[PDB]
Design a protein around this ligand. Structure first.
Ligand SMILES: [Cl-]
Ligand SMILES: [Cl-]
Ligand SMILES: [Zn+2]
Ligand SMILES: [Zn+2]
Lengths: 29, 28, 21, 29, 21, 28, 21, 29, 28, 21, 21, 21
């Protein structure tokens, strides 16, 4: 895996791909 | 209304919620 | 949950707001 | 709903989500 | 218009509703 | 050729049409 | 319409150009 | 077809749409 | 694990591979 | 190929790395 | 946090793993 | 190359055709 630059909707796409059926929390500062 | 599934469901959550944040929990 | 309401069934953006923090 | 910053393909995704089966016109200036 | 507002600034989903059929 | 549906169909329209604009009309 | 030609059936990017303004 | 400004994931989406079942190589410099 | 198809499969490849580049070959 | 392993079946991001250049 | 790191800088998929259930 | 042209500048779908199998 590479380091990624991920803003906005791209970040939540990445979380979806990583977490899958486990689900995830999106929590911006 | 539309069916929103997987990556499309979370992009709709981002849209609606934005910097409020959100939770995506299939198991719920 | 969300998958049942929005993916299996259909839902509005208003319904989607229920999953906001 | 929050205010959104939406450029290019992200704007048309948003229009798709809002308008749904109603359809929509994409008309940049 | 609202289109350009969205990208240079911010816009609401309500504003986008103006573009539906 | 591919099947292009929903959000994928409009992103293909954006790509092809760009600043010409486009119409997406399922009812048509 | 577009859904029948491009989603139900398949279509080329050339066919897609028919929906440009 | 119009000229397009395409970075990152948007470029690979475009390659997918153009190439289809033919497949493609993504090769950044 | 999830099913990753079409445009979703290549965006997952971009994510994982990045500036390493990748190949998408359905015929393989 | 990738379609069989990742789309038809399922695969991990580790499996996806096998298609990196 | 990692969220902001991702957008202002870079982040790993490993870091994103911290946000799963 | 064309890849970098696309992001720093603009490119055509025709140019992208050069990357298909
Ligand atoms: Cl972007
Ligand atoms: Cl899909
Ligand atoms: Zn983007
Ligand atoms: Zn999809």
């Amino acid at each position: 895996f590479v380091n990624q630059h991920l803003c906005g909707s791209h970040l939540v796409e990445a979380l979806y791909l990583v977490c899958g059926e486990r689900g995830f929390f999106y929590t911006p500062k």
